[PDB]
Design a protein around this nucleic acid. Structure first.
Ligand SMILES: [Zn+2]
Ligand SMILES: [Zn+2]
Ligand SMILES: [Zn+2]
Ligand SMILES: [Zn+2]
Length: 1237
RNA sequence: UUGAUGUCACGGAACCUUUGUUGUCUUCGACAUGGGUAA
């Protein structure tokens, strides 16, 4: 009868399945069909659509139970007392008809001859298998006969590889369908019986079923008995209405990043002023839509929220386009590093690579990866690469012999959360900028997750084997690099709390109980095993060292550190443009922000450092296509056709720092004020010499590489180069961030660390100016550049140090003459417990100057001393001019569209052009939005209209833009390059100089004593005047084309800080009254020393001389630096103290005596380009000339009305004649030190 | 819908290769007004 055993196969792993195939190709010839003879199959009731159920064939169960019977009869006794068994009568009538044949070898427990053909009850194994369609039948299927859309709907497809042991690159791969058991746990089937077999037959069937470990290709317990497309349309319609489609991908990334929880939408970043006009979240608005969607009653589940956000991001991205023993070893796999497993899918096109997430949004540890890693470890221990191929016969090598009885169980995590995302970019060596389209990201799991693990080895020897003992010892030590991206650094599992128990041998009592109780492989079975397991681990019988030696690193940084993360900047509470990289761990269902440095960035820096120094055959080794070759760099690091030998790891900080906000502003080189654009800000981590950041971490090296000679020589050379401060870490190195002091190496056994470890007087001035004792001098004057430039030579690359080039470091000292100010611009109420108050810069209670300000100060001097393009300039500004009553405007009206305007007689039509509309549009732009706050009139020549104005007299509008004034040569070079852009760099071309922060050498000084003479750590307040906007309209008198931009703007040096110190106006002599616009700040007394360093790379002989000349200038001339330079606050002079170069990785040289050759040869290059041009060089020296003794100039800004300041000051009302004219403003400001009075 | 006297798929790691890097001194002085005049 039908012994209907509804054998619920409670899988502990996702069982596998095959894609459906039509009956036409259902034959032995089909490769996919013959391959998929051991997995499940998808039955389709109707072929029009993919509706159906999964089915299971009973032949697979028959094969599995027959194999179990083979093993059990081999193990237990060899022969039963009641009846004697045989090895098994196996024969084929025809080989072709059989789809597959047992190509392995059976067991030989008995040598008794094959049974007679003509017999009925002659041995148990034969009478079970047949030869006497009446025993098994059987088809397992889903419970209740459900219906589903299809195999893709109920599960998913995953792809498996075959990695060669030697190279590492996979050769061939295949796909299969996997289905989880969390919602499909049970299966229902039946097994028949003739009611003829003996009791031992049923006993063999039952205990063989209990003994089976893997069925349907998975370890298991064989237990017998809308409203999103509309949202996407709304967002894309808002973007189309507001245009600016370039931000679609950025918005997609930002809105996909909000899948953590619904609480982050409320705390989205705000405007700089705290308003609600963010440039992305208020483009419409989108913020209101997000808030009211988050407040919806249905979208309260975290799962619903995250999947809705994912759907929105995905749709928006697409729119944008014999003695036998057993062992029960267990343990816990604590993850000490992020891990990644390839589960690439097609739905999430935004992210190329995705981790293997379970259907319940939890992480998975597939058995394939574990088995592959075990294969790698055992093969590299035995030193016998298994060169077997698919099919044939199972090779009898030691590795396969050991692995023919190894099983490992799948595991699942518990930290259910959306995985974080990590970016990656490529760098072009010849330009130092990201390549086109080299922007991609991969999704990575968090760190600090526990995975249960259980190993069941069914051996045939006494105890565990020595190879497996050594492998487990290595794993417990923490040498188990399991997950992928091991070259990057991801994946490192340490077996914690190892606790094993060698179960037994092929006995008849404890083995019988083990068989009786299902082998304790279920959850409760695992519990009552763990209650009796014994701690410890067996010792190795013959220990072998691992092939991966650990190296420690201790990097010390003495400056702020920054690592970019643009996507994370769109969700932080503060609206900062650039923020440091942050990683999240798993601290018990918590995500603490942990600051770290990207292992990818560190690996890239090391790779570039080792690449730049070596020389293969005269080529730089960077421009080589590589591909297939045997370079040293390829051999060490790896290429597309070979795995690497070095693995890096993330570096963390040995402190608890918190970010500090800095922000910069660009300055136009002609107006002297802010250039608008965007006040970009950054939040670099804090770091100072007093409390330097201690970066600590460790990377791994292969033992063969360490033992090799040339490889360790290359590594030592690269480490020495990094230690010499030539490859700063992090980003924004051109400002001063990411400077490195030292790099110690330990644990290398003294194999790599062994390789690594009269200033000429300045010249005298020659300029001469005549300062009067009564004349009043204007604050700022203009310097005119040359007509043309020398934008001819091609810039040098960054592939390798070429012959005749120079590289090193420069030390200098800065001493202030006049009072210096560097406001914080962070806290507005420091002195004031409305009015604004600021103090001097402070990082760690150690006052210093930022390096970017010095960068700008010296870059301006270089750009003016050698003619070059205006690097920062605004070329979109229309200038109006309020005209006077000297004109011939005619009346008219604008009502008839198409017919344009018409004339009037009292107090036959003219067409209007389209350009005239633009002038009217901008005319009513600050007419209403003034700071100090349809009948029309038109013009004509014969049929055109020149200008259109509302009122009888108003401001004439300029036709050509401001940018079309100066010559084409001086216009900015956005992308051969002018000499200034060659050195400091460009948006496309990286620079070749680096600056750094300043620091003190003596105790501080202050202009005024503090509120209480308690300590010198703080200064006192001083009242400033009113700082007011510049206006180019004064420099450009009118609309005539003859007027053009004169050049650059500079402030002369004078002594007016005395007047500001006490309550006297710089001009009218009155006291400064309290008001919301006035300013109060701190001040340092003149005479404070400072010190800072400059680095350089790949400089010509003449270029280096110019930079030193452009930096120090010469005694008697000083730069200008600080706040409120109009009133003469802050003058600094740079004095060189040491110049160092480098000749080789081992040898450095103090080239202190060679500077006269460079300085002398610097002017030689000037004669080559410009022969007789010296006025613009001489004019610069006149502007920066310092007031010597008893030559105090009088500098002030005159006011409007002469009646004001009755001392005799002439105001601007009557200054527009005699002294200044309409046609003399440009030339009057040409000569420096020209008194207006 | 499994078709019987043979399935080591417990015969296979989405594995390999790429620095969110570059370019910006928290800087700062001149007017604003529409008519007046006017048949
Ligand atoms: Zn037999
Ligand atoms: Zn083998
Ligand atoms: Zn190569
Ligand atoms: Zn240029």
């Amino acid at each position: 009868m039908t012994t209907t055993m509804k054998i619920s196969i409670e899988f502990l792993e996702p069982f596998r399945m095959t894609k459906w195939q039509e009956s036409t190709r259902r034959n032995k010839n089909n490769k996919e069909f013959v391959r998929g003879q051991a997995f499940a199959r998808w039955h389709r009731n109707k072929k029009d659509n993919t509706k159906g159920r999964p089915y299971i064939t009973g032949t697979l169960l028959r094969s599995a139970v027959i194999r179990s019977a083979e093993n059990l009869l081999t193990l237990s006794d060899g022969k039963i007392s009641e009846k004697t068994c045989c090895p098994g009568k196996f024969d084929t009538e025809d080989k072709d008809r059989l789809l597959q044949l047992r190509q392995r070898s059976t067991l030989r427990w008995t040598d008794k001859n094959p049974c007679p053909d003509n017999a009925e009850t002659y041995c148990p194994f034969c009478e079970l298998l047949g030869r006497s369609f009446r025993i098994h039948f059987g088809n397992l299927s889903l419970p209740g006969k459900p219906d589903f859309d299809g195999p893709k709907a109920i599960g998913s497809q995953r792809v498996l590889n075959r990695v060669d042991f030697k190279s590492g690159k996979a050769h061939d791969f295949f796909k299969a369908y996997e289905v989880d058991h969390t919602r499909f746990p049970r299966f229902e089937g039946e097994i028949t019986i003739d009611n003829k077999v003996s009791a031992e037959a049923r006993k063999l069937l039952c205990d063989s079923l209990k003994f089976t470990d893997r069925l349907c290709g998975a370890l298991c317990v064989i237990r017998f008995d809308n409203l999103a497309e509309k949202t996407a349309e709304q967002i894309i319609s808002i973007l189309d209405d507001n245009k600016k489609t370039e931000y679609t991908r950025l918005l997609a990334d930002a809105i996909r990043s909000l899948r953590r929880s619904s609480k982050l939408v409320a705390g989205l970043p705000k405007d700089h002023d705290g308003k609600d006009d963010h440039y992305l979240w208020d483009i419409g608005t989108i913020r209101q839509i997000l808030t009211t969607s988050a407040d919806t009653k249905e979208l309260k589940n975290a799962g619903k929220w995250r999947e809705f956000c994912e759907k929105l991001g995905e749709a928006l991205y697409l729119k944008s386009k014999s003695v036998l023993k057993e062992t029960v070893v267990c343990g816990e796999l604590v993850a000490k590093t992020p891990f990644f497993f390839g589960a690439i899918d097609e739905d999430a096109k935004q992210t190329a690579l995705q981790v293997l997430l379970t259907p319940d949004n939890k992480y998975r540890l597939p058995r394939s990866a574990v088995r592959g890693i075990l294969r790698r470890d055992l093969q590299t221990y035995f030193d016998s690469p298994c060169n077997a191929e698919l099919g044939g016969r199972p090779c009898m090598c030691k590795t396969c012999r050991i692995m023919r009885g190894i099983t490992v169980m799948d595991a699942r995590s518990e930290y259910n959360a959306p995985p974080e995302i990590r970016h990656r970019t490529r760098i072009n060596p010849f330009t130092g900028t990201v390549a086109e389209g080299a922007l991609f990201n991969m999704e990575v799991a968090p760190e600090g997750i526990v995975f249960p693990f259980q190993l069941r080895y069914r051996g045939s020897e006494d105890g565990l084997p020595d190879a497996l003992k050594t492998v487990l010892k290595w794993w417990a030590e923490g040498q188990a690099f399991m997950s992928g991206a091991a070259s990057t650094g991801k994946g490192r599992f340490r077996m914690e709390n190892a606790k094993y128990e060698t179960l037994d041998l092929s006995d008849e009592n404890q083995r019988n109980d083990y068989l009786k109780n299902w082998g304790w492989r279920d959850e409760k079975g695992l519990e009552e095993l763990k209650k009796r397991l014994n701690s410890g681990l067996p010792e190795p019988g013959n220990y072998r060292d691992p092939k991966w030696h650990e190296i420690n690193v201790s990097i010390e940084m003495a400056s702020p550190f920054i690592n970019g993360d643009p996507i994370r900047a769109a969700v932080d509470k503060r609206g900062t443009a650039v923020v440091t990289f942050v990683k999240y761990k798993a601290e018990g269902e918590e995500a603490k922000p942990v600051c770290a440095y990207k292992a990818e960035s560190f690996r890239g820096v090391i790779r570039s450092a080792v690449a730049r120094i070596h020389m293969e055959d005269g080529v730089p080794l960077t421009e080589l296509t590589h591909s297939d070759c045997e370079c040293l760099l390829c051999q060490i690091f790896g290429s597309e056709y070979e795995a690497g030998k070095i693995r890096f790891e993330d570096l963390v900080f040995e402190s608890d720092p918190e970010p500090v906000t800095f922000d910069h502003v660009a300055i136009d080189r002609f107006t002297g004020g802010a250039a608008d654009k965007k006040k970009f800000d950054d939040s670099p981590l804090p770091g100072s010499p007093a409390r330097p950041l201690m970066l600590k971490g460790s990377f791994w090296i292969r033992r063969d590489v360490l033992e090799d000679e040339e490889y360790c020589k290359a590594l030592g050379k690269a480490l020495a180069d990094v230690n010499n401060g030539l490859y700063p870490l992090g980003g924004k190195s051109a400002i001063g961030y990411g400077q490195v002091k030292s790099l110690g190496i330990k644990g290398d056994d003294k194999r790599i660390s062994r390789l690594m470890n009269a200033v000429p007087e300045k010249p005298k001035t020659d300029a001469e100016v005549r300062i009067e004792a009564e004349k009043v001098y204007y604050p700022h004057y203009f310097v005119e550049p040359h007509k043309k430039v020398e934008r001819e030579e091609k810039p040098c690359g960054h592939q390798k140090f070429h012959e005749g080039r120079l590289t090193g470091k420069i030390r200098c000292k800065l001493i202030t003459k006049t009072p210096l100010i560097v406001p914080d611009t962070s806290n507005d109420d420091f002195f004031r417990p409305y009015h604004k108050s600021y103090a001097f810069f402070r990082l760690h209670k150690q006052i210093m100057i930022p390096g970017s300000e010095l960068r700008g100060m010296v870059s301006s001097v270089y750009e003016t001393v050698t003619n070059s393009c205006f690097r920062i300039f605004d070329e979109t500004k229309r200038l109006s001019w309020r005209m006077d009553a000297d004109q011939d405007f005619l009346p008219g009206r604008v009502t008839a569209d198409g017919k344009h305007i018409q004339k009037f007689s009292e107090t036959e039509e003219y067409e209007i052009p389209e350009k005239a509309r633009i002038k009217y549009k901008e005319l009513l732009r600050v007419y209403n939005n003034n700071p100090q706050a349809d009948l029309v009139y038109f013009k004509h020549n014969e049929k055109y209209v020149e200008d259109i104005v509302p009122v009888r007299i108003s401001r004439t509008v300029d036709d050509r833009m401001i940018g079309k004034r100066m010559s084409a040569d001086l216009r900015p070079c956005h992308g051969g390059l002018c000499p200034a852009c060659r050195l400091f760099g460009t948006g496309s071309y990286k620079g070749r100089v680096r600056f750094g922060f300043a620091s003190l050498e003596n105790d501080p000084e202050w202009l005024i004593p503090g509120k209480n003479p308690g300590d010198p750590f703080h200064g006192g307040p001083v009242m400033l005047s009113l700082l007011e906007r510049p206006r180019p309209t004064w420099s450009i008198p009118g609309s005539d084309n003859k007027f053009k931009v004169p050049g650059r703007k500079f402030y002369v040096h004078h002594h007016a800080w005395k007047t500001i110190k006490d309550g006297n106006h710089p001009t009218t002599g009155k006291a400064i009254e309290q008001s919301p616009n006035n300013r109060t700040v701190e001040a340092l007394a003149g005479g404070n020393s400072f010190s800072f360093e400059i680095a350089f790379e790949n400089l010509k002989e003449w270029e280096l001389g110019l930079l030193i000349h452009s930096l120090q200038l010469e005694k008697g001339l000083a730069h200008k630096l600080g706040m409120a330079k109009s009133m003469g606050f802050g003058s600094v002079e740079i004095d060189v103290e040491s110049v160092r170069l480098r000749k080789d990785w081992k040898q450095w040289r103090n080239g202190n005596s060679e500077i006269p050759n460079w300085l002398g040869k610097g002017f030689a290059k000037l004669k080559e380009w410009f022969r007789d041009e010296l006025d613009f060089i001489e004019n610069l020296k006149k502007l920066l000339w310092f007031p010597e003794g008893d030559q105090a100039p009088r500098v002030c800004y005159p006011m409007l009305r002469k009646k004001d300041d009755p001392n005799g000051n002439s105001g601007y009302e009557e200054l527009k004649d005699g002294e200044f004219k309409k046609e003399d403003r440009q030339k009057k400001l040409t000569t420096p030190w020209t008194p207006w009075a």
